[PDB]
Assembly symmetry: D2
Homo-oligomer: 297 residues x 4
């Protein structure tokens, strides 16, 4: 027949299996707080910073109602939030099959629900990835332990020439972060994925697909950014200390969704005033109130 | 006489919202385990095996899922709800039939204790068949708590809940031992909240309150703020990683109290075998820890 | 008679009096480590990032030999380091009287020896301040406790219109950080300063002087930067945790002077190899060695 | 018999360079006070007032400036140098004339201890007039230390310094009590370094080594890395800020041992009056701390 561009977001905030049991037995990792807010506020704030307003949250059946209770339909923050369940954790690239109907014919963005980013001109780094309407965009960050991640190899010109998932002998220390930008080809790339030996559909196979077509942009997220680790109990604790230090220093919050919707002009002063009221007695609501007065450059 | 325990893990209101908007504080981890493991481990260390967990209606199912009926750790867990947050002393009205004609002990679900000879320090409270024991602890901010005042001879002469002008820096901790009188004292309480400090004052007036000092060489950790939640997890991380030993591991404590045997400990470590907690429980079977 | 532009740096790493006694009784604050290196490496690294190679370190008479033992004459790192003593702490603006001969007819830069900065495109933020050959440049950063600092007030257009030192009622939450860029007028501005009521020559009077002549640029250092606090034992501990978290995450060091001189091309591979050798057994020397191999973007 | 003390605060080589390039580790603060205050406070808590500080030649003047002759805190401090880092047992050759015919105790200048009833735990070692006492502590990484092996009955049967295959996870801590034999045992040692574990093995072979367990409810903190230095300061910050009480404050401990009086404590707090440490010492004059 005959047919005659915006970008949707997906947050994968599914099962971390038993790795962090028993800490995570009664509740999933992405609802645990990092200092003063739930973990999912951070990657959600990241999507919002990319200008993305229509967002699918993928979680386990057990925990979806709790994600729904925390976040609603998004209307309070100028967003539209929908929900989908992942019955079993079959790999990150399942997000695109699970989210196939949500995505439709649009461009998309995947963020892991346990990743947090901090640093200056992050809005602008996401802007270039979001503005690119063709191909895929990922970010490479220097890490101590690249063997844990998808690793990107660069030629002497600085061109990305290979990707490898958890290599025993990394070709560089540049890990692919858990924020991915995709055009309309990804659902089709995802549907042709064959499981890997450990029973998972690998995002690195999706990104390699783009690489082999010449449509993978790999931007460096520099060392002046913090891409923090929530993979261990220890790293979770370091992520909370990190955010506490920045917030207590500056009197500004990292990854406050109310604030970000306010600054984007997705909600207005009066709506922000309403969101503050039920939290007026604690520091978070008193912080939302203070935003109405102050110019923050 | 057998002593029954109660963990009160009720609501903290909106004070830590949005961090606790999704789920109650006592289910969140402190470092490597759910917060409630810590006060539970305290009761177990006092020899207490029959225990009532009281939480909000929304969250009981989840305490219940986490901990079950206790039988896997040689405990006998029961559960009950606190519909609204109307004071710690409701624990004894909600827990009345559970307690029966027995001695009891109440620990708050968010209190963490650490230190040497804690088993002994709780032994002396536990073995008192008569009266009540509580613990006083020096703190920077006594206004936040029940404050005990002492005479020059070291005798408790008043308790005050959240006084504007604390009489001392001694704060009553969230661990309480009681005889058969506490239910009836709980039942005649009048709202101020139904205050645990009124329960303890009732025993004080009758010369039946033992106020033992919990010395400066014990850790009574603060989980009342986001900052103090953090310091607590850092505090436990430092101890566990220095020693290769875990703080408030119920499976280990059951095993050491001989409430479960080596074969049961082995089955418990099986599901967790690929991570550090299972590896740890496996390592306990063949190492002597003094 | 008849006469016929580079920028020199000064690090003020003098007396913190008795405020941090007894921690600082046997040694000055600026030699205490922040995680894995001495505190003075951080502000020194900041000057180096601004392209500054000729640097005066001002310390107490008691501690100069220890600053000299740590840092030498700078030749090992492609720098020229000189030393001057401050017999009594009479205020930060004394740096210009103490450093009058060192400065000569050049432009200058003052950094406090206990300030540390982290964040992306810091090189570029310093570049604009350093390239400005006229007037003064300072940086304003949002803090929880502006009452502790020099506070900058902005009009609705975002123009700086006043400065106040430790105001009881701050006009904004924007504090002036401890990095200052100056033209050839500063030594003369400094020499006319009259002590303040508490017996100190105030840098805020110097900056107000520039403001009243229309030659103070106040650039915002955004919230995506960390300007960390070493004013208390607590904040010192948070600064060390902060740097440990970033360094252990990335496998890169913050404020490694050897690395920065290497990357600037002030020293070469073989010199860096020599600086590594006496530290080869510890993580710091093994890190200097690894830099010779790897491309870090 | 009077027992004299030695703090060994010698060189850590280049291991923490460049952080310690400027000055030795034991002069750096842990949170709010210089590291050496902590092992010093340990000796004081054991009743030890006559103390020899041994440090590198470069740094002695500065230990000497920091601490003086001790008289202001009711101590009697002396000082001596360790020219090179040739093993902890040199402490007894360097300290030989200082020790004389007396009993002695050696603490490493970078060891931190915390916990309840520490005064008592050191009392039982201190009061032994014969033989040597050391402390064993469970740790994750016993290879880094002197490792003690026990028989099924809990008796020490071997000590090994930094074994490649530790026999247990029990590590000997950096606090050692000795009788009059240690100098002569130190003097017959042969370089392996002159090893403190050889000194302790000499007493073991003669049935004269008391190996007491320092339980899991005590903190023996690690200052051997940059990471463990940090965890230690965080650990002390959390205790001091929770309690409003300081850990290892020599002035306070002198005052409580009645080695200095209220008027002396008052003069000590005067120079520090504008900061928290002086304010703290002033606050100790009019508060009862149990
Ligand atoms: N840039 C901001 C902002 N600022 C904005 O989102 C913003 C939005 C529109 C215009 C200007 C600034 C904020 O309010 N909170 C915040 O954490 N950041 C940093 C951030 C945001 C999301 C994820 C990681 C870091
Ligand atoms: N004392 C123990 C023990 N020891 C025991 O449970 C025990 C009990 C009876 C006999 C032998 C060991 C332990 O295994 N785990 C633990 O965390 N502690 C300390 C502790 C226990 C509860 C709360 C805070 C600290
Ligand atoms: N930008 C760098 C760099 N990179 C450089 O200095 C550099 C120098 C010349 C060209 C490219 C990069 C570094 O090596 N270490 C470092 O801590 N930073 C960040 C930094 C440097 C100084 C003060 C605060 C943060
Ligand atoms: N026990 C005390 C005390 N208590 C005393 O010194 C003391 C000694 C004799 C009688 C009464 C109190 C103190 O004041 N400060 C302190 O840090 N402690 C614990 C301690 C002391 C040294 C090292 C590690 C922990
Ligand atoms: Cl960067
Ligand atoms: Cl104690
Ligand atoms: Cl920014
Ligand atoms: Cl113990």
């Amino acid at each position: 027949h005959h047919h005659h561009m915006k970008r949707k977001g997906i947050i994968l905030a599914g099962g971390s299996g038993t790795r962090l049991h028993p800490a995570t037995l009664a509740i999933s990792k992405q609802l645990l707080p990092v200092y003063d807010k739930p973990m999912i506020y951070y990657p959600l704030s990241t999507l919002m910073l990319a200008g993305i307003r229509e967002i699918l949250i993928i979680s386990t059946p057990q925990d979806t109602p709790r994600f729904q209770q925390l976040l609603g339909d998004g209307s309070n923050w100028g967003l539209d939030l929908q929900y989908a369940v992942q019955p079993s954790p079959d790999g990150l690239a399942q997000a695109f099959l699970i989210g196939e109907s949500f995505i439709g014919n649009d461009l998309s963005a995947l963020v892991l629900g346990d990743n947090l980013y901090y640093g200056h001109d992050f809005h602008e780094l996401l802007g270039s990835a979001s503005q690119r309407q063709t191909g895929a965009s990922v970010f490479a960050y220097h890490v101590l332990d690249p063997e844990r991640y998808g690793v990107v190899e660069f030629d002497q010109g600085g061109k990305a020439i290979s990707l490898e998932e958890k290599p025993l002998e990394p070709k560089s220390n540049y890990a692919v972060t858990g924020l991915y930008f995709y055009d309309q080809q990804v659902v089709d790339i995802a549907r042709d994925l064959k499981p890997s030996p450990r029973g998972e559909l690998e995002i690195t196979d999706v990104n390699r697909a783009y690489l082999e077509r010449g449509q993978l942009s790999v931007e460096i997220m520099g060392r002046g950014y913090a891409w923090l680790d929530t993979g261990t109990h220890d790293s979770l604790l370091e992520a909370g200390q990190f955010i506490a230090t920045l917030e207590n220093r500056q009197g500004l919050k990292v990854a406050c969704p109310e604030e970000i919707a306010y600054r984007q002009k997705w909600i207005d002063a009066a709506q922000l005033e309403k969101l503050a009221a039920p939290l007026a007695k604690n520091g978070y609501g008193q912080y939302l109130k203070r935003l109405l007065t102050e110019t923050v450059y």
